[model samples]
Target: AFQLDSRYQDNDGDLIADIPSDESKLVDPSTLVFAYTPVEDPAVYKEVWSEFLDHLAETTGKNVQFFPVQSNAAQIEAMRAGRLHIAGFNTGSNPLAVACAGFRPFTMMAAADGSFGYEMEIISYPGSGVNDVEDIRGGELAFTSQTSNSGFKAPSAILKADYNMIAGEDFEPVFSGKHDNSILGVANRDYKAAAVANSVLNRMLSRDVVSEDQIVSLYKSQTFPTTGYGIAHNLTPELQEKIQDAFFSFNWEGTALEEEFSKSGEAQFVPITFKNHWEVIRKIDAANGVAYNCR
Candidate 1:
């Protein structure tokens, strides 16, 4: 079962940190630092999230600053240290962020019909000698990072469970740091193969960053939840409610957020819970021998 760090309280069995009841423990910052998951260029995403962050500022009555994080670890650490107030943690990092950083996830992006998710895909360049999943043995394969679902964790568990393939033993493993790097590496023939989120790949393709003929898909896993948006556990209850309201109330039509995220088929923010939305991810973590390991 998933467990929160000892420093956090989950009195309602929700599997996430509870708000501190102590008046002195709560924070009502004048500036709310917000960050999106670093799947691609932070500079581009900073602008993409601008209009929505403005709405967030208007609703919460505070200055919302777009904090460009370079990695999942840094983003979680920022929240743990009380420097970050709002964030969107990726699928595989959600549980860890919640247990380690006192994160309280309440929402995720969804389509108009309420369908939401992305699949993990193993891809290779044309004529890379990796035509199929089994051909990956003894060749190099790139993974974004250990904290990524499609980029690492999901692929790891699926490979081991279904193909009986291990990263080091069956293939040469490499870290690309981000999904875009892995996709670009494979497309450029720098890496023979890579595991990535199809959602990120779709966005890259839609932007003409890479061509359709450059990469070929070898494997695709079942759909998994996408990035989760939430706030720190110690925020003032009133402020937290306002932040949630901002997400649910924001208009997507003609906004930069909609224009960018529409590439991945996300239309608006919808309610979610770490307990329910993340159950499958927790199972995958367990299958991979992953521990919370909060430091």
Candidate 2:
């Protein structure tokens, strides 16, 4: 098994910290706190996740509250400190969240047949003169944030491995803070081209937050898993199972999740394990020399 921080244990050999065997170490809160990854505006996502939270409330027979996080670091810190019970840590931050926060990832949104993943899409707009990935060679390219996979890491790795394009040497890379920003920046022609997650881009288009003609995809990457959903590792086993059940059993027929994410091809929740699903992401992080050192 891989090494874990001194604050946790991995007795299960699952590459994830095991729930505490000692009764004194287990947690069972009356009100569960949940958060989604801050890939976009918190206000927009709050309304987007509402119906699912209500379904979660019913599924666990416990009250639930959405904890809107401002950053990936803040979100992981909340779980590490035991303030957050459940969350959906985005792709690039999942490993760090697990290493530092005792997050036990168990599921992800998937298409009906259990296929789940999104791609990194390099996009451009009218008058941008960036017709393709190679066209971005001399222009400035936008990246969402350092911690983002599709938005930054994957694109960086792909650009270097595939095109030999280094950020400063070949094309300049600008940080856009979030995927929505990068997408909109390209859409509004604020940036000539940008790397972003097709999943987030699709959701934005579905909600009319961005127009289809506003941006065009020049490159689409190999599929990579989306956010990893789970609870704090120390939650009582019974409570953890209830939380997992809620994700798998919730009816998405008319909910906010389906309404928004259905366009991105996620129709149901599918089982996943951090050990298996996050391998490629961990490798990408290594390629980028990212440090998982807890802050």
Candidate 3:
């Protein structure tokens, strides 16, 4: 009766899951739990998002709680299981979240003038005997996870297409589980090289989480869309709009959010639709034959 994926329908073909037609299925939770992508240290992000959650609570008139997720997999699974109501899924995992969890992504962090998203980069510790992207051959490269766009997908495609390098053949690939881990891996020389989002790198640098001198860029990919913020597809439409308004209406000036993200150029929330903003990421996934398996 609808298109998109076998697990969810994109009846409008917007590349996002459509709301269920049954009125009884819609949910209106008394308390809302929100989560950001697990890109860095959750403990640090929890403090960073505290002010925004306060504003979100004020706007929606609901008891809003920050749900700290440990992995992209756990974040998506929480939504799929009806535990998470609002979320900001990272770029690469957005499509899978939409396909499997019925997530209705609608906004992203952007600048005051509307520029947003981030670039994927492969970096290495200087003098690690790896000076260029091609030099990663015969060494280990750290990846955040398979579900990450900048961390895993973009780097995988770039390495294979540009350098004819494939993991396990040209080099060994290891999973660091989070961008912070990968970046720190390179900094500590635990990993000879790692692919990461420059956006995450900037945040870490701003907080002195990691020094710029700790890593050197070997290659920077085209800018990719940042996190997609959205609600579950089955939320009552009225409640959904309320949540959306909370994001767009929140003031970012002088808040913890602005303090942490300004270094990465994000000043406020900007409207976005999965159909229009995520086309490039989906194409990258297709180039690698990624499946929308609900599992």
Candidate 4:
């Protein structure tokens, strides 16, 4: 454990690393709080985060809290009110959390190859004749969330500029709420096709969440950053390092996190560079007239 001189104590009262700690605002290790993305069941997610939280607490010799929050607004509200420390926000929500709630990502899960990306698979049941994006030109397509970068934004960009299609016009859009529902809808011939993430489909394939024989990918869009880890804009420096080390150091073996990915045969956390993975997101946001600054 280490302590900074008391004089550097109150920069912005953010409790996170003050600008004095690192000129570029990189993290310092004086505070210890953590959070996960606002994805799925918070209870289930906390169980998945337990091993890492314990590891985080042990390594930093500090208190680590897992603030499992549900819904986009709730997560942002918690951070804004100083109840959250670190967070793993999903695709579109990242920007909103950063802007409205003080979240800033420093790392995200990567693949076995150290790649941190997944795609939007335009998929359908085999007999649906949805061999390509064009095949779905005349039917309803399920979208996971309006704010999801992969689920809606990317597909919108590609279909508009390249495929000469428009949502609610050339193809009807349906908000299925989640990737699983979107996938099942497509598999059951509910929507004819769905614009959902590859990781979700990959998970189903590995877990027998759906049989390989029952599904097919029409085309996977280019990769983008997956869900990510970040600290609230004001957590103390001491807490930040604990969270990072915990995430960068947990054992996924036999845990729900690993088990979830094991279906896809993935083993550990992967590395990602924000700028590299987020270029596509920025582009899509711009093209779609999205204002991340808007709460």
Candidate 5:
């Protein structure tokens, strides 16, 4: 079963850290550090999220700094240490971040119709000879990181349960560190095949970073939750309220955030809960023998 670290309390049993009742335990920082999931280039995302960060600053009445994190572990560690104030943890890492880092996710991007989520896809370069899942044997398969759902966890469980394939046994495995690298690696034939989030791939395709003809899909899994956005659990209640307001109240029309995220059909932020939205992910983690080892 999933459990938070010993340092945190979950009296409500929502599977997330509870805010400290002692007034001295709450924090109210002068500058808020915000970061998006490190799925792609951090530099590009910094610009894409600028407009919303400005709105967040004005709403929270504090300076907001964008922390360009390069890896999921680094991002989670920052929050665990109280260096990161607000963030968007990806699908697979949400449970770990909440369990170990006191991440209180409350929202995710959705379409105008309120539907949200992305699929995990296994892709190979055209003419790579990997036409199906079994064909990947005796060759290397690329995964983004152990902490990514579409990138690692979901694909790991699916491959083992359905195909009886195991990394380093049925097929060699390599880590690409980020989804963009894995996608580009397969497109350029650096690896035989790769598991990635189609949401990231679609955005890259729309921007001309990669073309449809360069890749082929071998497998696609059911829709899983996307990046989850929220704040550190120990923040002062008033500050947390304002941060939530900043996400739900921002206008996306004609903004860079819209232009970039609209490629994947995300229109705006919609409310979410770790308990409700992350059940499938926790099951997948269980299937893969993953434990939330805070260390």
Candidate 6:
């Protein structure tokens, strides 16, 4: 079996490589490169966000380019290597981004009504009859990856305390690599049930990545902050602030960005902080003795 702790010896539990000593290559806004989360397919999102990226370029008045990354590790690597400047990252990746790649998160998306949260849903195949976390006790459950909060850690914390269900004992969790895969596996009967971020599920649903009625959301946890945007420390302060202003002030209301997040119940960007909203997450990590210091 693969040792989960093997990532600690310069790789105990983290996927990203450590930062280098040389700061010579680190750059600023004139060379800004951006990315969205790898929670879904990037190719699709590139086209989806072209107009928004263009809007960002216009707003920030920089020569920005979209750096499509496929995983949290890859995104962290790019930033550590002094390539990526700004990015929109999933919740789980944010810690890795900060710890291993110098990412500094500052803002996130909220609803049209100003709700800045999303739920974690327990879902299963249609007709599988597993409508809730308790129903799937002693069965196989799919989580996206070890770093996944909604798919693994958060659900474990919630289920044990709320439903008395335990993963890998009362049930086993299989890693599906990505959230969409986790959700689709359940919907296709590939697994008994799975934990997923409602944001991803809804995003896919809106994009026709999945039919809304195809799977059942057996249970939904309270909302947590959604994806966030931040810049790498290697970026200049001026560049970072400009990108942030563009992000926080860009008019997503009448653009594709607005349509995209609306289904996820987010109306626009909401100001956030690494020190505040992340407190519960920090507590959870501390209780689990987990650290974000990646390889």
Error of 1 at 145 (Å): 0.5
Kindly provide the TM-score of model 3 when superposed on the true structure, using C-alpha atoms: 0.97
Worst 10 residues of 4 by lDDT: 1-10
Backbone clashes for every candidate come to: 0, 0, 1, 17, 0, 14
Candidate 3 Cα outliers beyond 4 Å, as residue runs: 1-7
Model 4, global lDDT: 0.67
**Tens digit of per-residue lDDT, candidate 5, span 181-217:** 9999998999889999999999999988889999899
TM-score of each: 0.99, 0.95, 0.97, 0.79, 0.98, 0.85
Count of backbone collisions in candidate 3:
1
Per-residue accuracy of model 6 over 187-294 as CA lDDT, tens digit each:
678987888999889888888877867878888887677777887765555556677788776777577777777777877777887657765665555544566555
**Model 1 weakest lDDT span, ten residues long:** 40-49
**lDDT tens digits by residue: candidate 1, 171-227:** 889999999999999889998889999999999998888899998999999999999
Displacement of residue 281 (Cα, Å) in model 2 is: 1.0
Runs in model 4 deviating more than 4 A are 1-35, 38-46, 60-70, 262-266, 270-273
Sort by TM-score, best first: 1, 5, 3, 2, 6, 4
Q: Score residue 167 of candidate 5 by CA lDDT.
A: 93
Candidate with top lDDT is 5
lDDT of each: 0.93, 0.89, 0.89, 0.67, 0.94, 0.73
Per-prediction CA RMSD (Å): 0.7, 1.5, 1.7, 6.7, 0.8, 5.7
How much RMSD separates candidate 1 from the native structure? 0.7
Q: Deviation in angstroms for 53 in model 2?
A: 1.3
